[PDB]
Design a protein around this ligand. Structure first.
Ligand SMILES: *[B]([O])([O])C1=[C][C]=[C]C([N])=[C]1
Ligand SMILES: *[B]([O])([O])C1=[C][C]=[C]C([N])=[C]1
Lengths: 332, 329
């Protein structure tokens, strides 16, 4: 009956050691901070606890891409080969032509093997060289985390800077997100939560080293209060420099130019799923071997929901939807 | 690259003996009639071939319910108990209160086993244990619309078959469309097949009268074309049927939605706003499968009917819609 019941109940059901949730509706915001950030050392999860964003990193990457487009430095229809010259990929008999848009919207065709290759700690172009596409570029929407790693390399090539520096200079600094960072690699982050991989029970895993190339697709780190700032930025675009406002509108534009299933006509935007049903409802989950998270926005009602958890859990990916139901009709 | 390629490709993939498809866009309509209604006797699929509509039936039942509502004889909020006094259902410890809307929108909580059981309805479902409290969740159960058949009969005082004919099939001019009373021979009915390992006939089994409203309506390609055109073009339709039709497409928003599904259920239709309104339903009996989809903004109407049960046929309307929408699939 109570939101706090819903969230607490789902946390126990998911067996996550720490859960952090923030929910805002019509300018009223409640926080839910639960559990321990490190089971063995008994360190309680707090507002300062840092969580890997997994695939929720893609919205930061996509927004930067659209900032560059807004400023005229890049175009969606640009051939990928200009920014990643050495990257050759093949469809059937003949090397395939690919655009920046194909990675933005997951219409590239990159094989499923390319995730466990990009997570492995060669530059991305040589890392994906002589790959075989699952389909013709543009033909279908297939989700592949590696697509946004390709976009990281684009951002560096065009910028002439590192991904971390762009993220900070373009997004984190101007927005005031002081605990959010695109990690360079294995170097330690203070206040960070330990990550767990479920089954049979939650044993620690965090330690495995993080591939630099995969950061833009899966390795941005953040906190609940910074994610709150991120949400409020997307909900309240005004008071932001015209460039960012326009890049944000364009970021939420879904690619309609793909086949849609009978039960699913949702589109993918620049690191977001866009759903018109009881919408606009804009969302994305994150799943990493040892972290999981979700975010959902329903601007028409100024609704913004984010959940961050130190364990990989399919329940966490459904959690933002459950909260949204409770807000929409008092039921979940 | 060609619609004809798409449909024919999908028919080979699905291994359906007969497939009939009709597609209309911007008042241009193409028909695709393939295969044999009966494999053994080599009887070719033809415009007159009759196919079971499975769950497609539900839109006929739902529209009739909405016709009764429009006339004032019925209301969504009515207690089911008034029409089916004998049918008493329980949730947890104690008996649970059910409305007409619960069956219309599949928020009743009827257990899964009931389908195989419906294959009077109230004595049939007496003592049933609800999966959840009425209204709490959307859970599709074919039997929900069988309850609505019994409601239509009790309100009308007529049989389900007579109402469907008098209210819908006769006025709309659908000659070959009928709600089957009990097992009895239908002239032109295609034989039904069950896949696997290779599809042999499943024809013999007898049809439960109680289940007709949910999955037992029979029809033809040209009649389904008339049905589609009636939903797409409602002018020249009596005011009551027009209003019933608008109300039939109103989805029930009062249920929890999954992260990847925000689609609503209407009165025997799924209502999708994405690249929509896009209204669809699929039918799947042991030995028949079918689909239908409408995208009115573009006067688009698609129907497929097949004499074998196939998950591919359920996706076939969406493939065609993709082809129409973006020339790809
Ligand atoms: B991403 O690949 O980490 C990802 C994980 C879980 C859900 C979604 N949508 C993306
Ligand atoms: B119905 O239960 O026969 C049915 C079958 C297949 C799909 C849908 N939507 C309903």
């Amino acid at each position: 009956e109570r939101l706090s019941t819903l969230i607490h109940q789902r946390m126990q059901e998911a067996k996550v050691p720490a859960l952090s949730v923030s929910v805002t509706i019509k300018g009223v915001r409640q926080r839910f901070v639960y559990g321990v950030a490190d089971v063995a050392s008994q360190k309680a999860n707090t507002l300062d606890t840092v969580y890997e964003l997994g695939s929720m990193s893609k919205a930061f990457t996509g927004l930067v891409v659209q900032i560059l487009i807004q400023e005229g430095r890049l175009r969606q229809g640009d051939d990928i080969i200009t920014y990643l010259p050495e990257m050759r990929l093949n469809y059937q008999g003949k090397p395939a032509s690919l655009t920046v848009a194909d990675f933005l919207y997951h219409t590239s065709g990159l094989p499923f093997s390319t995730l466990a290759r990009l997570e492995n700690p060669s530059a991305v172009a040589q890392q994906l060289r002589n790959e075989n596409l699952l389909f013709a570029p543009g033909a279908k929407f297939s989700y592949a985390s590696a697509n946004y790693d390709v976009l990281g390399a684009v951002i560096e090539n065009v910028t002439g800077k590192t991904f971390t520096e762009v993220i900070a200079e373009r997004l984190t600094q101007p927005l005031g997100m002081s605990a959010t960072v695109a990690v360079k690699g294995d170097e330690i982050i203070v206040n960070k939560a330990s990550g767990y991989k479920l089954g049979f029970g939650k044993p620690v895993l965090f330690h495995a080293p993080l591939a630099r190339n995969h950061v833009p697709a899966a390795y941005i780190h953040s906190t609940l209060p910074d994610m709150e700032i991120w949400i409020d930025a997307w909900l309240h675009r005004k008071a932001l420099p015209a460039t960012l406002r326009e890049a944000m509108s364009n970021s939420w534009r879904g690619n309609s130019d793909v086949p849609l299933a009978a039960d699913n006509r949702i589109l993918y935007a620049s690191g977001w799923f866009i759903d018109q049903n009881q919408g606009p409802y804009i969302s994305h989950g994150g799943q990493n071997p040892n972290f999981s998270s979700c975010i959902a926005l329903r601007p028409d009602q100024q609704i913004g929901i984010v959940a961050l958890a130190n364990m990989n859990s399919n329940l966490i990916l459904q959690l933002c939807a459950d909260i949204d139901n409770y807000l929409r009709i008092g039921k979940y």
